[PDB]
Design a protein around this ligand. Sequence first.
Ligand code: HEM
Ligand code: HEM
Ligand code: HEM
Ligand code: HEM
Lengths: 145, 145, 140, 140
Amino acid sequence: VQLSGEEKAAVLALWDKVNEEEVGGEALGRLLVVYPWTQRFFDSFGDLSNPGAVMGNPKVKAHGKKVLHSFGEGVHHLDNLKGTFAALSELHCDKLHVDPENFRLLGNVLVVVLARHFGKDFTPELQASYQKVVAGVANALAHKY
Amino acid sequence: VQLSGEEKAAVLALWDKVNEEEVGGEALGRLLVVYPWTQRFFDSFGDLSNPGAVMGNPKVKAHGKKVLHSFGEGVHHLDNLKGTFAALSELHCDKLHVDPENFRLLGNVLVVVLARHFGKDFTPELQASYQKVVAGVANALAHKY
Amino acid sequence: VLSAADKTNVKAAWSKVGGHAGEYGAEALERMFLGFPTTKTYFPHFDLSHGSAQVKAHGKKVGDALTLAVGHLDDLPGALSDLSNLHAHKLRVDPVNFKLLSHCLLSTLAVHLPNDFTPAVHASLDKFLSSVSTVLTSKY
Amino acid sequence: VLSAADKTNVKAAWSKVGGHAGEYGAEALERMFLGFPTTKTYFPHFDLSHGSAQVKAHGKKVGDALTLAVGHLDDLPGALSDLSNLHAHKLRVDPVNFKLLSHCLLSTLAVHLPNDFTPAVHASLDKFLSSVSTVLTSKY
Ligand code: HEM
Ligand code: HEM
Ligand code: HEM
Ligand code: HEM
C-alpha cells in the first residue's frame, strides 16, 4: 500500500518478468494441495484428489491466471487498492463466503512461488516489499465483509 | 462499523449499563491469564505470576479502565472508527509493536466478559452486533501497520 | 486440557455443565450462525431459525461429543477419530471455523455459569477446546 | 510430519538441505526481520544488519534444532522440551511469530532448492513446521 520510490520501482520491475499463466496456475495449485480445505470452494473443477491431478487440471491453470491478472492490477494501482478490489470483495463475501484468512494464505503461497521462480533475484529486501503488496491486496478484498 | 438502526440502538442501550472499571479490569486480566504471551508487553506492572496476582493488580484495573473508555469512544463514534483510533494505531504499531491478531483476541475476551456480566440479556442477536463493533475496532487499530 | 491442573479444571467445569451440554451446544451454534454468517454455508440442509428442531438435535450431538472428550482427555485422537475424518476429509471444514465455535461455546458458558466461569477455568477450557479443534483438523 | 508419507517426504527434503541448514536458517531470519518488522523486538541485543555475525550464529542454532527434530519425528515434545520452556515461559514469544518464521523458511528453501521444492514436499514441510511450532508453544 505504501512503498518508497525505490521499492515501487523494484516491485514493478519484477512484475514485468512474471508469467501470469505459469505463476497463477502454480500458486492456485499449491494452495489447493497445501491447505486442502480450500478445495471445497472449487468443487466444480472436477478431480482434485492428489497433487498430480491438481497441478495438471486446466480449470486450475485458467482460474490461477485470472487470479494473477487481478493481482497485476493491484500492483499497477498501489494507491487505489480498495477501489480496484471493491467488486471482487463483494463477490468473495456475499456470493462465495470465503473466510478472509484464506486471502493471506494465498498471498503467502504466491510469495513462495515467486521465490521459487526467481531464486536469488528474489532478495530479502524485495520479498519484504512483496509482503507489503500481498497484505494490501488481502486487506482490500476483506473490506466489504 | 455498519449496523441497522435497531442494532445501533441495542448496542448503545447495553453500553449505558457497562461499568468501564469492573469490565475493563476483568477483560484485561483475563487476556493476560488466557493468552499469557501478552504479559510480555506489561512487564512494568509487576507480579503477573498467577490468576490471583493478575486480577487484583491495581495497574491491570487502571489500564483496563482506560482500554474500555477508549472502546466506549468507538461505540459512540461508529461511523468514524478509523479517525477515532488513528493515534492509538500509531502507538501500538510504531512504539509498542503489538501484532494486530492480539486486538481480535482482546475484542473476543471483552465479548465473553459482557456475556458473563449480563447473562441472558446478552442475547445471540446482541452478541452478533457486538462482534461487528469488536471487529471494527480491531480493524481501525490495525490500519497504520 | 494438557497439564494435570488443566485436566482437573476441565473435568470440574463440565460436571457443572452436567445435563445442560446439549442445550448449550445448540445455543452456541445459534450464536455462531448469527455472529459469523460464513459458517451457515456448511448447513444448507438445516432450518437455521431460532428453536429449529435440527439445530436443537445437532446441538445435542456436539454436547455429547464434548462430554465424550472430557472423559477421554488422555487419548483425544483415539476417542474422536471418527469425527476427524468427517470434518477434515468429508466436510473440509475451514480450520478458522473451529476457533469461532470455540468462542461461541465459551460465550454461552459465561452466560449460564457466571460464578463458575472464573479466569483459571476459562483458561483451561480454552486449551481444552483448542485441543479438541486440533484433533478434528488433524488430517489437514 | 505426522503421517508416514509426510515423514518420508520431510526426511528426504532435509537430506537435500544437508550442510546448508545453518545458512538457510540465517537467511530465513533475515527475510523475517525485513518482511515482518515486529519480530525485531525479540532481538534487542543483536546486531540485525546483513551478514551480522550474531544472526549467522543464531541461524546455525535454528538449523541444528530443525535437524534435531527431523531425526526425532516420533517424539518431538521430548526432543524439543528445552526449547518449549525457553520460547513460551522465558521469552513469551507470540505464537503468530512462528507462522511468520515458517513462511520465511519455506521461502528460503524455494529460493535454493527450486527443483526439489515440489507441491507434495511443500505440503509435508508445512505440516512439519506447524508441528515444530505447536511443540514450541505447548506451554501456552
Ligand atoms: C489473493 C486473493 C484473491 C484474488 C485476487 C482473487 C481473485 C479472483 C478473481 C479475479 C475471480 C474471478 C471473478 C470473475 O469471474 O469476475 C475469483 C473468483 C473466485 N474465487 Fe477468488 N481470489 C482470491 C482469493 C480467493 C480464495 C483464497 C479463494 C478460496 C476460497 C477464492 C475462491 C474463489 C472462487 C470459488 C471463485 C469462483 C470461481 C468460479 O468461477 O467457479 N478466491 N477470484
Ligand atoms: C481492543 C484493542 C485495544 C485498545 C482499544 C487499546 C487501548 C489502549 C489505550 C487507550 C492505551 C493508553 C494510551 C495512552 O496513555 O494514551 C493503550 C496503551 C497500551 N497498550 Fe493497548 N489497546 C488495545 C490493545 C492492546 C493489546 C492487545 C495489547 C497487548 C500487546 C496492548 C498493549 C498496550 C501497552 C503495553 C500500552 C502501554 C501501557 C503503559 O502505559 O505502560 N494494547 N492501549
Ligand atoms: C468443537 C468442535 C466440534 C465438535 C465437537 C463437533 C461435533 C460434531 C458431531 C458429533 C457431528 C456428528 C453428527 C452426526 O453423527 O449426525 C458433527 C457433524 C457436523 N459438523 Fe461438527 N463439530 C465441531 C465443529 C464443527 C464446525 C466448526 C463446523 C462448521 C461450521 C462443523 C460442521 C459440521 C457439519 C456440517 C456436520 C454434518 C451435519 C449433518 O449433516 O447432519 N462442525 N459435528
Ligand atoms: C521454527 C521455530 C524455532 C526454532 C527451531 C528455534 C530455535 C531456537 C534455538 C535452538 C534457540 C537456542 C539458542 C541458544 O541456546 O543459544 C533459540 C533461541 C531464541 N529464539 Fe528461537 N526458534 C524458533 C522460533 C522463534 C521465533 C518465531 C522467535 C521470535 C521471533 C524466536 C526467538 C528467539 C530468541 C529471542 C532466542 C534467544 C536468543 C539469544 O538471546 O541468544 N524463536 N531458538
